[PDB]
Each structure stands twice: as C-alpha cells, then as structure tokens.
Amino acid sequence: KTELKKFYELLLAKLPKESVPILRTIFFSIRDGQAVTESSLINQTGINTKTVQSVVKILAQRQMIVREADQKIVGALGLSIIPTTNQIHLGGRTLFAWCAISTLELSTALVADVDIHSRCAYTGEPIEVTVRNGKLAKTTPDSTVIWTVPFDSEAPWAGGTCKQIHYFSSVEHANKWKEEHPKLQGEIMTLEQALSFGNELKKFLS
Ligand SMILES: [Hg+2]
After folding, report:
1. Cβ partners under 8 Å of residue 87, min gap 6
2. CA–centroid distance, residue 176 to ligand 1 (Å)
3. What is the spatial distance between Cα 13 and Cα 15, in angstroms, rounded to a whole number?
4. What's the 43 CA to ligand 1 centre distance in angstroms?
5. Phi and psi (nearest 5°) for 139?
6. How many Å lie between the centroid of ligand 1 and the Cα of residue 204?
C-alpha cells in the first residue's frame, strides 16, 4: 500500500491549504444524509467566502465532490446521498458509493458496519457483502473480487477513475470482461485489501 499512501501525500501537496477542513465538513455531512451548500460551509468552517468558493471549485473540477444540477453538494470522496449501483447501508441510513473500492474503504473510514449491494460488471448479477467489526461476514458470490486501475493524482474521481473500478462475481468473469476490453489496464484486488484502503482515506482526512 506504499503506492496508496504516496498517492494521497501527492494529492494533499496539490490541493489548496483549506481543502481538508472543507472536505471533512462535506464528507461527514454526507455521512449524516445532509446535502451541503456553500453557505453552510462558510458558516461552519469560518473560512473566508472567496476561499470557500475557490476550494469548492477545485474539488468539483477534480470530481472529489459531486454537485447536483442546482449545485448543492451531494457526494464527496466516494460517498453519496444520491443513487449509484453501489448501495451501502451504514449508520442506520441508505447511502451510496462511487465504486466498489469505496463501498469497503468507507466502512473502515467511517468506523461503521455496512451492508453492501452491488452488481457484477460482467454478468449483471447481484453482489452482497457485509462487514461486522472490520471483518467480512457475508460475501455472495463467495468469489467476488474488485478490478482496480492505477491511481492518478490528476485524474478526476467520481466521473473518471471511479468509473474504471468494478466488482466482478469471480476472477473468471473478470477475465471474460478483460477479453472484451483488451486495451484497458488494471488488476484484481481482494475485498480485504479494499477494506484496508480506508486507513489511508482516514489519514488523508486527518
Ligand atoms: Hg472510487
């Protein structure tokens, strides 16, 4: 995971200084099911209104946050109040994740048991995973794995790299998909590894 730690260190170096206070404020509001506005950020963080505006613009350009058409902020750092294929029940509410990795790393980052429902990117079949006290409990199909791609400090998240990450019902099905998408580059990782990625997300938000 040296690569992941180094990815986040490079990203922090690139982001504006007030990025972490703003990202925390957004992220933990989304956790609580509450869409975020710039006025709420200004009032809560105490940051100058021009700096809030410019930081939010950058985070949105990088698709590290997602805004609906009316510009309210509804997702951040993989976590979403609006629907995706990856449904996560966490902290007594139904939220969503931007990709397969997010479904598990958010459990770790938010220190929360989760129930995950998703889909095999090849077969379309349902995938169910649960986590209890940091340990994988249910996993159906039992052979479920994740396809990931190299992380990129300049790549946008929600509509960029997150769209290239997938759940597969098995490695054999991942391989069928790969045969049909021969030019795409990536690798298989395990669900346990995805859980551990939340460590680095927590550090990033610290
Ligand atoms: Hg993602």
Report:
1. 94, 95, 96, 116, 117, 118
2. 22
3. 6
4. 29
5. -150, 110
6. 15
Q: Which amino acid is at 40?
A: S
Range of the domain at 107: 1-206
Give dist(CA 47, CA 50) in Å, integer. 8
Instruction: Output the domain CATH number for residue 140.
Output: 3.30.450.410
Please tell me the distance from the alpha carbon of residue 55 to that of residue 77, in angstroms, as a whole number.
Answer: 15
Q: Which two tokens stand for residue 19?
A: 């990025």
Which residue type sits at 181?
H
User: How many domains does the chain divide into?
Assistant: 1
Cα distance between residue 20 and residue 26, in whole Å? 10
Experimental method: X-ray
Instruction: Tell me the structure's resolution in angstroms, rounded to a single decimal.
Output: 1.2
Q: What is the DSSP string of 34-92?
A: --B-HHHHHHHH---HHHHHHHHHHHHHTTSEEE-TT--EEEETTEESS--SEEEEETT
